Amino acid sequence: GIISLLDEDEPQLKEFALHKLNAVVNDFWAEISESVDKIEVLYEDEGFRSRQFAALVASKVFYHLGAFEESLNYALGAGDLFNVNDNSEYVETIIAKCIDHYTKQCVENADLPEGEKKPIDQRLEGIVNKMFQRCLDDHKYKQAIGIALETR
Amino acid sequence: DLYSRYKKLQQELEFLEVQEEYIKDEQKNLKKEFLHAQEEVKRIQSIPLVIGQFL
Amino acid sequence: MSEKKQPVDEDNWDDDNVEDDFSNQLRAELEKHGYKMETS
Amino acid sequence: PPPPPAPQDVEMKEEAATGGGSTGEADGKTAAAAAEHSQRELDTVTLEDIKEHVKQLEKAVSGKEPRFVLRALRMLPSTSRRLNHYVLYKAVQGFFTSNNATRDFLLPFLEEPMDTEADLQFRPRTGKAASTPLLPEVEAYLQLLVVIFMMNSKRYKEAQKISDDLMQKISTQNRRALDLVAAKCYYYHARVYEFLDKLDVVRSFLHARLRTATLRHDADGQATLLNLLLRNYLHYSLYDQAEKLVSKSVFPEQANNNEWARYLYYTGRIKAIQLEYSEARRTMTNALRKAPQHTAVGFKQTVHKLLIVVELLLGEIPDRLQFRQPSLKRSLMPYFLLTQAVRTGNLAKFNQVLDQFGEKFQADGTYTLIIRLRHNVIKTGVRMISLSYSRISLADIAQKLQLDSPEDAEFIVAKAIRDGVIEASINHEKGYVQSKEMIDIYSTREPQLAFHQRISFCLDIHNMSVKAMRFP
C-alpha cells in the first residue's frame, strides 16, 4: 500500500512515491499492478511534469507483467534518458522491440508510397543515430549497412 | 560477416516452411487413394466363388 | 523424487474403514436392540 | 580402501557423460533438447542423493575433489590421456596416504579448470565444475565448519548465476542443462540459506533470476524459480500472493512431470489458505492422482496429511486410512482422532481433540481449519439431515444438535439457503420447517450438457496423443 499516500494532488508527493518506487519496486511488483490506473492518471496529466518518470515506471511494471506494445508506448513516453542507458536487460530488450518496430514500421511505410505514414514519435532515432555512431566509429560498417537493409 | 551470415538463414527456411505445409496435403490425398486401393481390391469377385481345397 | 521441501519431513484395519463408517453407530449393545420389542 | 573404488568408478561415469558427452551434446546438438546426458546426470544426482555422494567419509578423507578438478583442457585429441591421468591417479587412495584437501582447499580447486588453459567455451562444463564438486558438500549440514562452506560454495554458484547471465552473450541454449542443474542447486540454496535465517536479498536474487529467464531462454527456469518464490512466500508472512493474482504467468510445457505436480500442490495450499473449497480440493486431487510413484519412502505422507485438510473441511470425508503409512501412525495419533472428530458430531469432543492435540495442530499451523470446522460440523449435520427428510422441523434437528431455540435454527437454515444445499423453507408461524427434497429434478438433457465437456475433453486428449505420437 504505497499509492493511497497520493491524496496530495500535486506532483510533490508523487515524487515521494517515486522515491519509494526506485527503492522497493521489485519487492512491490505485486503492488503497482493495481496502480496501473493511477500511473495512467500520472501520464495523462501534463501538469505532472515528471510524466517522463511516470512512463519510466510504467514501462518497468509492464516489463514485469509482460506488456510489450504498451511498454513501447511508454518507452517512447519515457523521454531522453531512455535510450542513453547501457543496462543489459531492461533497456536493451525494450529498444530491441522498439527498433524492431522501427524496422517493421519502415517496411510498412516502405510498403506505403509517398507519405501518409505513421510519423516519428518524438523519442525514436536516439540510439539509432547514437549506437549507429558506435557501429560507425567502431570502424566496421556492417551494421551501418544493416540498418539500410532494415529500413528499405 | 554481419551482413549476410544472419540473413541467408531465411533463404533455406521459406522452402521447408512450404514443404511443412505440403506433406500435410500429400497425406490428405493418400488417404483418399488408400481407400480407392482398398475398394478396388473388391470389384472382381466374392460373389462368384469357386471351391478348391488347400494342399 | 525427494526434490521439494520434504527433506525435513486387512487384519483389523480395512475393516476399520467400514467400522469408522460405523464407530458412531451401535457398538454392539444387543439388549437395547433386543429390548426394543417388549416396551409395547 | 576397497569401498572408495565405488566412488572412483561412479565419479568417472558421471563426468565422462557430463564433461565429454554433454560437451559433445552441446557443441552442435539440442534441436529441442538432445542433451540426454543432462537428464542422465540428473539421474546420477538422484543416485548420489540415494548413496553417499562421493567423499563424505568413505573410510578416508578428501580424495576425489582435489583429484579430478584438474586438467580438462579440451584440446588436441589426446585429452583422453588427461582422462588416463584421471584414471591412474587412483593408486593414491588404495596404495598411498589420503590427505584432507576438501572444504578448505577447494577455493583454488574451482579456479584450476579456468587457470589450466582456455579449456572450452560452453557453460555446462563450468556449471559441472562448480556443481559436481559442490553438491557433494551440501547434504552434511552439521553447522560446524561445513555450512559456512556450503554458503561460500553457493556464493560460487551465485558466480554461476553471473556466468549463466553473461556467457555465450545471446541464444546458446545451455540453459536446458544449467537450469536443470540449477533447479536442484537453487533448492539447496534455499535450504542452506534457511537452515539459519530467512533469506532477504536472496529474494531479489530470485526475482532478478526469474526476470533474466523470461523469453530469451524460457526453459525449466521460470517454473522452478517460481516454486522457490512460492515456498519462500509460504514459509514466511503472506503478502505477495496478489503477485500471482496479477501476474499469473505460470504455464510452461510442465516439463519435469513432478515439478508441476508439487507446484499444483503448493498453490493448492495457497488457495486453501486464501479461501477455497472447490478449486483447491480439485487441484489437491489432481496433485494427489499426480503423485509420480511411491518409490520414495513415506514422503507423500506428511504432505498428504496437510493435503486433505480441505477435504476434512468439506465434512463429507470418511476415515482416510488407505493412505496411512504405519510409521505415520505415531504422528497421526492426533490426526486419526481428528478425522474421527469429523465423523462425530460431539462438541465437547470437537474442542477436546483441540485441547488434546493443539501442539500438533500448531505443527500443522493452519487454524483456518478450526476457524471453520465447527461450521463444518453444523454443515455436515445440515447436509445429512436435509438430504434425509422431506419436511423436517427445525426443532427436531435443532434440539437434536442442541440449539435450544428456534431463531438460531432459523439463522442456520437461512444461511444454509444462502449457502444453497436444499430448498428448505419455514412454515412461518413460530418456525416449524415446511420443505422438500429434490428428486425429479432433471436427468436427460442435463447429462448431455456435460457430455460436451466429456467428449471435448476426450478429443483434446486425442489430439494430445497425436502431438505425443509426433515425438518418435
XYZ file of C-alpha atoms in Angstrom:
719
model
C 0.000 0.000 0.000
C 2.085 2.887 -1.326
C -0.372 4.580 -3.706
C -3.063 5.607 -1.191
C -0.369 8.046 0.018
C -1.127 10.265 -3.004
C -4.222 12.285 -1.990
C -1.997 15.390 -2.106
C -2.864 16.284 -5.702
C 0.456 17.970 -6.584
C 3.436 16.054 -8.037
C 5.312 16.786 -4.768
C 4.045 13.576 -3.149
C 4.096 11.656 -6.417
C 7.838 12.313 -6.140
C 7.961 10.719 -2.686
C 6.007 7.793 -4.107
C 8.605 7.536 -6.871
C 11.356 7.755 -4.238
C 9.627 4.699 -2.787
C 9.333 3.145 -6.285
C 13.020 3.269 -7.198
C 13.770 1.907 -3.698
C 11.494 -1.148 -3.407
C 9.692 -1.634 -6.740
C 10.922 -5.228 -7.222
C 9.536 -6.258 -3.831
C 6.344 -4.298 -4.570
C 5.876 -5.718 -8.083
C 2.612 -7.085 -6.659
C 1.568 -3.574 -5.643
C 1.889 -1.460 -8.810
C -0.207 -3.829 -10.938
C -3.348 -2.408 -9.363
C -1.804 1.074 -9.591
C -1.605 0.904 -13.421
C -4.683 3.160 -13.422
C -3.062 5.917 -11.366
C 0.122 5.611 -13.419
C -2.192 6.337 -16.359
C -3.510 9.307 -14.332
C 0.093 10.497 -13.999
C 0.822 10.100 -17.715
C -2.363 11.906 -18.792
C -1.597 14.873 -16.529
C 0.569 17.398 -18.362
C 0.825 19.395 -15.139
C 2.579 16.324 -13.749
C 5.967 17.413 -15.073
C 7.562 14.106 -14.002
C 5.468 12.255 -16.628
C 8.794 11.049 -18.018
C 9.230 9.075 -14.807
C 5.562 8.028 -14.908
C 6.190 6.415 -18.287
C 9.507 5.045 -16.908
C 7.972 3.025 -14.081
C 5.043 2.296 -16.388
C 7.377 0.547 -18.831
C 9.097 -1.013 -15.799
C 5.915 -2.568 -14.412
C 4.761 -3.539 -17.902
C 8.148 -5.159 -18.491
C 7.326 -7.024 -15.286
C 3.772 -8.023 -16.265
C 4.733 -8.834 -19.849
C 3.116 -5.954 -21.709
C 5.228 -5.018 -24.676
C 3.363 -2.694 -27.042
C 2.399 -0.502 -24.108
C 5.992 -0.897 -22.971
C 6.732 0.595 -26.413
C 4.167 3.412 -25.918
C 5.507 4.466 -22.542
C 9.041 3.636 -23.666
C 8.615 6.425 -26.179
C 6.922 8.396 -23.404
C 9.912 7.781 -21.102
C 11.995 10.604 -22.582
C 15.608 11.403 -23.479
C 17.251 9.488 -20.603
C 15.613 6.353 -22.083
C 17.879 5.402 -24.995
C 21.165 6.510 -23.412
C 21.288 3.639 -20.885
C 23.831 0.823 -21.166
C 21.971 -1.714 -18.976
C 21.841 -5.336 -20.070
C 18.245 -6.450 -19.512
C 15.662 -3.701 -19.421
C 16.781 -1.010 -21.839
C 18.247 -3.322 -24.475
C 15.250 -5.661 -24.732
C 12.870 -2.732 -24.950
C 14.974 -0.843 -27.514
C 15.253 -4.190 -29.306
C 11.462 -4.267 -29.587
C 11.449 -0.507 -30.270
C 13.844 -0.544 -33.217
C 12.132 -3.762 -34.276
C 9.060 -1.561 -34.505
C 11.231 0.970 -36.358
C 12.257 -1.552 -38.997
C 8.800 -3.111 -39.374
C 7.431 0.443 -39.497
C 9.933 1.352 -42.210
C 8.897 -1.829 -44.032
C 5.193 -0.955 -43.811
C 5.943 2.638 -44.801
C 8.296 1.353 -47.472
C 5.137 -0.531 -48.465
C 3.343 2.846 -48.317
C 4.047 5.108 -51.315
C 4.778 8.817 -50.798
C 3.851 9.701 -47.243
C 0.591 9.088 -45.304
C 2.837 7.364 -42.748
C 2.899 6.998 -39.004
C 5.269 9.838 -38.044
C 8.429 9.583 -35.976
C 7.305 9.719 -32.371
C 9.498 12.169 -30.529
C 11.663 9.609 -28.710
C 12.709 7.410 -31.595
C 16.001 7.836 -33.505
C 18.066 8.247 -30.286
C 20.100 5.060 -30.213
C 19.544 4.823 -33.979
C 21.956 7.703 -34.523
C 23.815 7.098 -31.230
C 24.544 3.354 -31.333
C 24.881 3.932 -35.074
C 27.908 6.066 -34.274
C 29.175 3.213 -32.094
C 28.862 0.964 -35.150
C 30.460 3.604 -37.407
C 33.329 4.714 -35.151
C 33.981 1.078 -34.260
C 35.160 1.035 -37.913
C 33.118 -1.932 -39.104
C 30.243 -0.697 -41.246
C 28.250 -3.936 -41.489
C 25.663 -2.722 -39.005
C 25.775 0.690 -40.701
C 24.562 -1.000 -43.884
C 22.422 -3.475 -41.900
C 20.147 -0.610 -40.881
C 19.998 0.269 -44.603
C 18.746 -3.280 -45.123
C 16.275 -2.934 -42.279
C 14.776 0.403 -43.326
C 14.326 -0.309 -47.095
C 30.212 -11.324 -41.750
C 27.348 -9.435 -40.071
C 25.851 -8.576 -43.487
C 24.636 -11.951 -44.805
C 25.545 -14.534 -42.132
C 22.213 -13.933 -40.432
C 20.032 -13.096 -43.443
C 20.730 -16.176 -45.566
C 19.024 -18.075 -42.714
C 15.548 -17.226 -44.079
C 16.598 -18.324 -47.597
C 16.621 -22.067 -46.933
C 13.876 -21.536 -44.324
C 10.962 -20.383 -46.517
C 11.276 -23.575 -48.543
C 10.820 -26.053 -45.709
C 8.038 -23.814 -44.410
C 6.313 -24.628 -47.690
C 7.175 -28.355 -47.552
C 5.965 -28.264 -43.934
C 2.652 -27.107 -45.366
C 2.945 -29.614 -48.253
C 3.498 -33.106 -46.796
C 0.305 -32.495 -44.773
C -1.654 -32.178 -48.032
C 0.016 -35.226 -49.552
C -1.085 -37.208 -46.515
C -4.518 -35.610 -47.038
C -4.646 -37.115 -50.554
C -3.103 -40.518 -49.894
C -5.898 -41.490 -47.501
C -8.258 -40.984 -50.455
C -6.114 -43.120 -52.710
C -5.694 -45.695 -49.929
C -9.479 -46.026 -49.807
C -9.519 -46.343 -53.610
C -6.863 -49.074 -53.402
C -8.768 -50.985 -50.703
C -12.110 -50.841 -52.500
C -10.546 -51.787 -55.830
C -9.330 -54.958 -54.094
C -13.004 -55.947 -54.103
C -14.522 -55.407 -57.525
C -13.549 -58.659 -59.246
C -15.107 -61.315 -57.021
C -16.669 -62.682 -53.815
C -19.915 -63.154 -55.319
C -18.660 -65.783 -57.874
C -16.668 -68.054 -55.565
C -15.392 -71.422 -56.752
C -14.307 -74.188 -54.412
C -10.960 -75.886 -54.207
C -9.107 -77.172 -51.197
C -5.705 -76.304 -49.781
C -2.815 -78.651 -50.242
C 11.917 -37.995 -6.156
C 12.634 -36.017 -2.983
C 13.188 -32.649 -4.693
C 10.872 -30.383 -2.650
C 10.584 -29.071 0.938
C 10.194 -32.599 2.402
C 13.859 -33.491 3.482
C 12.824 -32.247 6.935
C 9.627 -34.367 6.860
C -6.722 -56.167 6.040
C -6.348 -57.634 9.537
C -8.348 -55.205 11.691
C -7.764 -52.095 9.637
C -9.660 -52.062 6.332
C -12.493 -53.425 8.408
C -11.801 -50.206 10.361
C -12.820 -48.122 7.329
C -16.369 -49.522 7.406
C -16.103 -49.531 11.208
C -15.296 -45.805 11.138
C -18.293 -45.630 8.905
C -19.810 -47.424 11.957
C -17.944 -46.038 15.027
C -20.651 -43.510 15.889
C -23.268 -46.245 15.324
C -24.402 -49.049 17.677
C -21.217 -50.620 19.142
C -22.861 -53.906 19.894
C -25.409 -53.153 22.605
C -27.558 -56.294 21.787
C -30.011 -55.781 24.682
C -31.288 -52.387 23.521
C -31.546 -53.970 20.062
C -33.446 -56.875 21.643
C -35.461 -54.978 24.261
C -36.991 -52.533 21.797
C -39.630 -55.366 21.329
C -41.389 -55.571 24.674
C -41.883 -51.979 25.779
C -45.187 -52.261 23.857
C 40.280 -48.514 0.676
C 38.298 -51.296 -1.146
C 34.959 -49.340 -0.907
C 36.317 -45.911 -2.222
C 36.799 -47.558 -5.660
C 32.990 -47.429 -5.939
C 33.008 -43.586 -5.767
C 36.113 -43.761 -8.005
C 34.024 -45.610 -10.602
C 30.768 -43.652 -10.341
C 32.661 -40.333 -10.345
C 34.264 -41.080 -13.704
C 30.981 -42.494 -15.036
C 29.370 -39.176 -14.094
C 31.765 -36.650 -15.537
C 32.557 -38.819 -18.592
C 28.914 -38.410 -19.612
C 28.666 -34.838 -18.268
C 32.004 -33.307 -19.376
C 32.857 -35.158 -22.560
C 29.468 -36.415 -23.624
C 27.285 -33.418 -22.785
C 30.019 -31.113 -24.090
C 29.681 -33.021 -27.355
C 25.918 -32.759 -26.842
C 26.385 -29.006 -26.512
C 28.839 -28.423 -29.420
C 26.262 -28.816 -32.113
C 23.121 -30.515 -30.751
C 19.923 -29.574 -28.847
C 17.345 -29.289 -31.600
C 14.811 -29.332 -28.805
C 16.974 -30.987 -26.163
C 19.494 -33.513 -27.486
C 21.425 -33.166 -24.219
C 20.266 -36.548 -22.953
C 23.352 -36.674 -20.733
C 21.776 -33.761 -18.840
C 18.893 -35.990 -17.759
C 21.435 -38.786 -17.293
C 23.379 -36.516 -14.944
C 20.252 -35.545 -13.011
C 19.628 -39.286 -12.668
C 23.145 -39.612 -11.264
C 22.493 -36.679 -8.914
C 19.482 -38.612 -7.625
C 21.892 -41.568 -7.440
C 24.305 -39.516 -5.289
C 21.336 -38.496 -3.171
C 20.421 -42.166 -2.665
C 24.015 -43.128 -1.839
C 26.598 -41.021 -0.102
C 27.702 -38.581 -2.789
C 31.434 -39.180 -3.161
C 33.663 -38.322 -0.148
C 31.634 -37.514 2.970
C 33.658 -40.046 4.917
C 34.213 -43.116 2.679
C 36.744 -44.637 5.163
C 39.210 -41.795 4.414
C 39.144 -38.039 3.949
C 39.021 -35.825 0.859
C 40.200 -37.801 -2.139
C 38.250 -37.037 -5.317
C 37.605 -33.282 -5.183
C 41.347 -32.375 -5.075
C 41.924 -35.003 -7.762
C 39.587 -34.760 -10.736
C 39.026 -30.999 -10.829
C 42.415 -30.531 -12.517
C 43.371 -30.656 -16.200
C 40.335 -30.923 -18.509
C 41.930 -28.715 -21.243
C 39.539 -29.627 -24.187
C 42.313 -29.783 -26.806
C 44.042 -31.954 -29.456
C 42.546 -35.483 -29.392
C 44.943 -36.806 -26.710
C 42.777 -35.395 -23.900
C 41.760 -38.977 -23.289
C 45.314 -39.039 -21.895
C 44.121 -36.445 -19.362
C 41.311 -38.906 -18.741
C 44.069 -41.525 -18.299
C 45.587 -39.178 -15.701
C 42.158 -39.069 -14.011
C 42.001 -42.878 -14.029
C 45.581 -43.670 -12.959
C 45.631 -41.186 -10.079
C 43.592 -43.835 -8.208
C 46.634 -45.519 -6.663
C 46.637 -42.716 -4.071
C 43.544 -43.916 -2.183
C 44.295 -47.635 -2.345
C 48.086 -47.557 -2.038
C 49.284 -44.126 -0.869
C 48.231 -41.943 2.080
C 44.991 -39.970 1.904
C 45.100 -36.323 2.990
C 42.493 -33.652 3.669
C 42.034 -31.308 0.701
C 38.286 -30.586 0.690
C 36.088 -27.738 2.006
C 39.182 -25.578 2.645
C 41.446 -26.116 -0.369
C 38.522 -26.010 -2.820
C 38.837 -22.234 -3.282
C 41.680 -22.571 -5.846
C 40.414 -26.006 -6.946
C 37.422 -24.284 -8.548
C 39.818 -21.898 -10.307
C 42.010 -24.751 -11.565
C 39.809 -25.670 -14.616
C 39.978 -21.996 -15.644
C 43.690 -21.486 -14.893
C 44.897 -24.598 -16.708
C 44.150 -23.262 -20.206
C 41.322 -21.799 -22.247
C 39.515 -25.134 -21.771
C 36.337 -24.680 -23.804
C 33.559 -22.173 -24.468
C 30.364 -23.646 -23.001
C 28.958 -23.014 -19.521
C 27.653 -26.597 -18.686
C 31.273 -27.585 -18.098
C 31.585 -24.578 -15.766
C 28.307 -25.485 -14.088
C 29.730 -29.004 -13.889
C 32.947 -27.728 -12.280
C 31.024 -25.710 -9.695
C 28.161 -28.199 -9.183
C 29.591 -31.746 -9.329
C 32.212 -30.880 -6.654
C 29.993 -28.711 -4.503
C 26.705 -30.629 -4.492
C 28.593 -33.481 -2.712
C 29.173 -30.919 0.099
C 25.654 -29.586 0.843
C 23.894 -32.578 2.481
C 26.113 -32.612 5.583
C 24.599 -29.593 7.353
C 26.022 -30.211 10.821
C 26.527 -26.388 11.135
C 30.157 -26.658 12.306
C 32.829 -25.842 9.674
C 30.526 -27.201 6.961
C 27.671 -24.722 6.444
C 29.732 -21.568 6.002
C 31.380 -23.618 3.239
C 28.035 -24.548 1.697
C 27.418 -20.801 1.949
C 30.612 -19.888 0.086
C 30.204 -22.784 -2.388
C 26.824 -21.416 -3.315
C 28.372 -17.962 -3.492
C 30.420 -19.600 -6.240
C 27.065 -20.808 -7.546
C 25.951 -17.171 -7.477
C 29.016 -16.578 -9.617
C 27.476 -19.378 -11.692
C 24.376 -17.187 -11.927
C 26.725 -14.432 -13.156
C 28.282 -16.834 -15.691
C 24.809 -18.029 -16.607
C 23.702 -14.456 -17.276
C 26.756 -13.183 -19.177
C 28.064 -16.281 -21.019
C 27.564 -17.047 -24.773
C 26.361 -13.397 -24.976
C 22.989 -14.366 -26.548
C 20.999 -17.535 -27.524
C 23.195 -20.631 -26.979
C 20.598 -22.711 -25.151
C 22.820 -24.214 -22.430
C 20.033 -23.274 -20.005
C 18.471 -26.669 -20.785
C 21.402 -28.075 -18.829
C 22.185 -25.312 -16.352
C 18.587 -24.605 -15.295
C 18.097 -28.373 -14.988
C 21.031 -28.482 -12.568
C 20.125 -25.067 -11.141
C 16.621 -26.197 -10.123
C 18.216 -28.699 -7.738
C 21.028 -26.436 -6.594
C 18.789 -23.389 -6.083
C 16.522 -25.545 -3.942
C 19.674 -26.402 -1.992
C 20.436 -22.658 -1.956
C 17.085 -22.020 -0.288
C 17.710 -24.982 2.044
C 21.126 -23.836 3.281
C 20.075 -20.176 3.400
C 17.032 -21.057 5.524
C 18.757 -23.573 7.779
C 19.864 -20.457 9.685
C 17.566 -17.463 8.983
C 15.023 -16.256 6.483
C 16.582 -15.051 3.239
C 16.143 -11.364 2.493
C 18.182 -10.149 -0.501
C 18.154 -13.697 -1.871
C 14.521 -12.743 -2.558
C 15.770 -10.118 -5.037
C 18.364 -12.607 -6.300
C 15.408 -14.886 -7.048
C 13.339 -12.027 -8.524
C 16.017 -10.906 -10.990
C 16.877 -14.557 -11.673
C 13.237 -15.053 -12.646
C 13.469 -11.858 -14.715
C 16.520 -12.951 -16.723
C 14.823 -16.256 -17.676
C 11.809 -14.536 -19.225
C 11.805 -15.036 -23.005
C 15.330 -15.488 -24.419
C 15.725 -18.816 -22.550
C 12.374 -19.789 -21.038
C 13.078 -23.456 -20.361
C 12.594 -25.071 -16.903
C 13.807 -21.945 -15.099
C 10.627 -19.935 -14.633
C 8.526 -22.694 -13.040
C 11.292 -23.928 -10.721
C 12.325 -20.455 -9.523
C 8.604 -19.816 -9.079
C 8.412 -22.889 -6.834
C 11.296 -21.319 -4.904
C 9.452 -17.986 -4.733
C 6.198 -19.699 -3.783
C 7.708 -21.705 -0.929
C 9.533 -18.509 0.089
C 6.216 -16.661 0.391
C 4.773 -19.805 2.049
C 7.319 -20.235 4.850
C 7.077 -16.564 5.858
C 4.250 -13.981 6.118
C 1.707 -13.914 3.355
C 1.619 -10.632 1.436
C 2.574 -11.330 -2.201
C 0.038 -13.906 -3.360
C -1.620 -10.948 -5.018
C 1.504 -11.115 -7.227
C 0.230 -14.422 -8.562
C -3.233 -12.883 -8.697
C -1.950 -10.096 -11.001
C 0.958 -11.787 -12.835
C -0.268 -15.329 -13.449
C 2.351 -16.467 -15.981
C 2.695 -19.943 -14.588
C 2.202 -22.181 -17.642
C 5.239 -23.889 -19.215
C 5.429 -27.210 -21.050
C 5.187 -28.553 -17.427
C 8.371 -30.451 -18.196
C 9.671 -32.405 -15.171
C 6.203 -34.059 -14.640
C 6.585 -33.932 -10.844
C 7.598 -30.270 -10.590
C 4.169 -29.410 -11.993
C 2.505 -31.880 -9.609
C 4.073 -30.460 -6.454
C 3.648 -26.969 -7.946
C -0.098 -27.523 -8.125
C 0.126 -28.919 -4.599
C 1.825 -25.779 -3.275
C -0.620 -23.458 -4.995
C -3.400 -25.690 -3.700
C -2.112 -24.943 -0.209
C -2.156 -21.273 -1.321
C -5.801 -21.326 -2.431
C -6.540 -23.386 0.682
C -5.108 -20.602 2.820
C -6.507 -17.745 0.713
C -10.062 -19.126 0.795
C -11.353 -22.033 -1.313
C -13.094 -25.371 -1.116
C -13.820 -26.379 -4.737
C -10.868 -25.261 -6.872
C -8.437 -26.006 -4.050
C -9.724 -29.535 -3.492
C -9.682 -30.259 -7.214
C -6.074 -29.137 -7.616
C -5.230 -31.100 -4.446
C -6.976 -34.041 -6.100
C -5.037 -33.551 -9.350
C -1.760 -33.393 -7.430
C -2.851 -36.449 -5.427
C -3.522 -38.555 -8.526
C -0.436 -36.860 -9.996
C 1.682 -38.426 -7.290
C 4.506 -39.715 -9.531
C 5.200 -43.071 -7.838
C 5.734 -44.472 -4.427
C 9.445 -45.084 -4.877
C 10.409 -42.588 -2.145
C 9.635 -43.827 1.363
C 6.823 -42.048 3.226
C 7.247 -38.644 1.597
C 3.694 -38.469 0.291
C 2.521 -38.993 3.860
C 3.102 -35.833 5.948
C 2.458 -33.751 2.844
C -0.819 -35.665 2.373
C -1.778 -35.046 5.997
C -1.547 -31.375 5.106
C -3.082 -32.027 1.643
C -6.525 -33.272 2.636
C -7.083 -30.704 5.384
C -9.537 -29.095 2.946
C -11.319 -32.419 2.461
C -11.615 -32.622 6.232
C -13.035 -29.095 5.958
C -15.591 -30.419 3.482
C -17.176 -32.616 6.147
C -18.051 -35.246 3.513
C -14.915 -37.285 4.158
C -14.772 -40.723 5.785
C -11.753 -42.032 7.627
C -8.736 -41.608 5.366
C -6.934 -44.774 6.340
C -5.909 -46.100 2.894
C -3.056 -43.544 2.831
C -1.699 -44.421 6.264
C 1.931 -45.392 6.480
C 2.385 -47.360 9.735
C 5.358 -45.102 10.503
C 2.958 -42.161 10.095
C 0.598 -43.696 12.696
C 2.569 -42.405 15.680
C 2.385 -38.908 14.162
C -1.304 -39.164 13.179
C -2.245 -40.177 16.740
C -3.780 -36.645 16.671
C -4.914 -36.835 13.071
C -6.782 -40.156 13.263
C -8.837 -38.869 16.191
C -9.268 -35.608 14.261
C -10.973 -37.319 11.327
C -12.886 -39.291 13.959
C -13.992 -35.895 15.324
C -15.053 -35.096 11.760
C -17.223 -38.216 11.703
C -18.622 -37.409 15.181
C -20.941 -34.510 15.937
C -19.876 -34.093 19.577
C -19.000 -30.557 20.674
C -17.026 -31.422 23.813
C -15.011 -33.845 21.698
C -14.697 -31.185 18.954
C -12.867 -28.993 21.460
C -11.249 -31.845 23.408
C -9.392 -33.056 20.318
C -8.109 -29.458 20.162
C -7.372 -29.478 23.922
C -5.589 -32.814 23.400
C -3.599 -32.055 20.237
C -3.146 -28.286 19.871
C 0.619 -28.715 19.611
C 0.369 -30.968 16.559
C -2.301 -28.586 15.268
C 0.408 -25.907 15.565
C 2.770 -28.299 13.774
C 0.154 -28.016 11.059
C -0.049 -24.314 11.858
C -3.222 -23.852 9.813
C -6.017 -22.918 12.328
C -8.097 -21.892 9.269
C -9.230 -25.495 9.766
C -10.538 -24.829 13.260
C -11.968 -21.398 12.377
C -14.457 -23.189 10.107
C -14.504 -26.751 11.421
C -17.362 -26.075 13.858
C -19.257 -24.567 10.927
C -18.256 -27.719 9.049
C -19.837 -29.827 11.810
C -23.107 -27.937 11.526
C -22.938 -28.157 7.709
C -22.351 -31.910 7.974
C -25.465 -32.043 10.135
C -27.493 -29.975 7.684
C -26.308 -31.973 4.639
C -27.136 -35.317 6.280
C -30.495 -34.399 7.788
C -31.603 -32.183 4.872
C -30.809 -34.990 2.468
C -32.661 -37.300 4.865
C -36.151 -35.892 5.376
C -38.544 -34.016 3.115
C -40.469 -31.865 5.610
C -38.382 -31.938 8.789
C -38.933 -29.451 11.604
C -36.190 -27.050 12.637
C -36.917 -28.020 16.247
C -36.209 -31.716 15.586
C -32.769 -31.101 14.072
C -32.165 -28.125 16.423
C -32.772 -29.892 19.728
C -31.220 -32.984 18.163
C -27.997 -30.971 17.801
C -28.505 -28.840 20.969
C -29.548 -25.464 19.541
C -32.070 -24.686 22.350
C -34.049 -22.043 20.435
C -35.956 -21.614 17.167
C -34.326 -18.400 15.948
C -30.732 -19.586 15.705
C -32.046 -22.679 13.935
C -33.755 -20.162 11.636
C -30.414 -18.424 11.086
C -28.832 -21.844 10.416
C -31.494 -22.771 7.844
C -31.310 -19.245 6.379
C -27.533 -19.281 5.992
C -27.902 -22.788 4.544
C -30.292 -21.456 1.908
C -27.734 -18.668 1.432
C -25.123 -21.419 1.114
C -27.561 -23.302 -1.138
C -27.804 -27.000 -0.310
C -31.567 -27.703 -0.185
C -34.852 -25.864 -0.802
C -35.946 -25.956 2.861
C -38.265 -23.085 3.867
C -40.126 -22.181 7.047
C -43.876 -22.567 7.676
C -43.700 -19.158 9.298
C -45.774 -19.003 12.430
C -43.094 -19.874 15.013
C -40.630 -21.724 12.788
C -41.617 -25.358 12.055
C -39.935 -26.007 8.666
C -42.054 -26.835 5.616
C -39.753 -28.253 2.993
C -39.000 -30.912 0.396
C -36.210 -32.980 -1.093
C -35.365 -32.862 -4.789
C -35.861 -35.867 -6.987
C -37.480 -35.379 -10.389
C -35.021 -32.513 -10.689
C -33.730 -33.391 -14.202
C -31.940 -36.359 -15.788
C -31.706 -36.332 -19.629
C -30.732 -33.033 -21.374
C -28.590 -32.133 -18.349
C -26.129 -35.087 -18.737
C -25.696 -34.219 -22.406
C -24.804 -30.690 -21.377
C -21.809 -32.133 -19.524
C -21.179 -34.689 -22.269
C -19.891 -31.880 -24.476
C -17.176 -31.383 -21.863
C -16.688 -35.170 -21.536
C -16.037 -35.824 -25.187
C -14.445 -32.443 -25.953
C -12.028 -33.351 -23.163
C -11.625 -36.755 -24.833
C -10.839 -35.180 -28.217
C -8.416 -32.781 -26.558
C -6.592 -35.841 -25.236
C -6.910 -37.427 -28.700
C -5.038 -34.510 -30.266
C -2.595 -34.513 -27.336
C -1.853 -38.179 -28.005
C -1.451 -37.169 -31.655
C 1.063 -34.461 -30.715
C 2.671 -37.056 -28.427
C 2.694 -39.614 -31.247
C 4.685 -36.958 -33.114
C 7.722 -37.487 -30.819
C 9.484 -40.643 -32.116
